[PDB]
């Protein structure tokens, strides 16, 4: 039940293979159509639903998929 | 990554997979 924007965020996280995952700057770099609040909300939703988790700190994310 | 960082990441990975299972099961 993902919005278009949540799916876009999730796809970017899925595509980063680094063990610490991608970071919030990587999301801002790519998601140039989205407000910072929308990116943050999508990260919250994805994290609450178990699609992603934070890794080395609260600004880095990896997907469970 | 350091030992400690890998330990924390794996704990986080398991917490998230747990949340996912709960959502898939509800």
Please identify, by name, the CATH architecture of chain A.
Answer: Orthogonal Bundle
Largest sheet composition of chain A: 3 strands, antiparallel
Assembly type? heterodimer
| Radius of gyration of chain B, taken over Cα atoms and rounded to an integer in Å | 11 Å
Q: Which pair of protein chains has the largest interface, and what are the residue counts?
A: A-B, 14 and 16 residues
Listing every helix as H and every strand as E from the N terminus to the C terminus, the arrangement of chain A reads: HEHHEE
- Given the C-alpha coordinates, what overall shape of chain B results? rod-shaped
End-to-end CA span of chain A:
15 Å
Count of structural domains of chain B? 1
Distance between the termini of chain B: 35 Å
Q: Estimate percent helicity of chain A.
A: 40-55%
What fold name stands as the CATH topology of chain A?
Answer: Arc Repressor Mutant, subunit A
Instruction: Please report which band the strand proportion of chain A falls in: under 5%, 5-15%, 15-25%, 25-35%, 35-45% or over 45%.
Output: 5-15%
- Helix count, DSSP H or I runs of 4 or more residues of chain A: 3
């Amino acid at each position: 039940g993902l919005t278009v924007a949540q799916n876009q965020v999730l796809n970017l996280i899925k595509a980063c293979p680094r063990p610490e995952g991608l970071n919030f700057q990587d999301l801002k770099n790519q998601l140039k159509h989205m407000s910072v609040s929308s990116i943050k909300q999508a990260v919250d939703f994805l994290s609450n639903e178990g699609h992603i988790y934070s890794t080395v700190d609260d600004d880095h994310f990896k997907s469970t998929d | 990554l350091t030992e400690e960082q890998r330990k924390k990441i794996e704990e986080n990975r398991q917490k998230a997979l747990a949340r996912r299972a709960e959502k898939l099961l509800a």
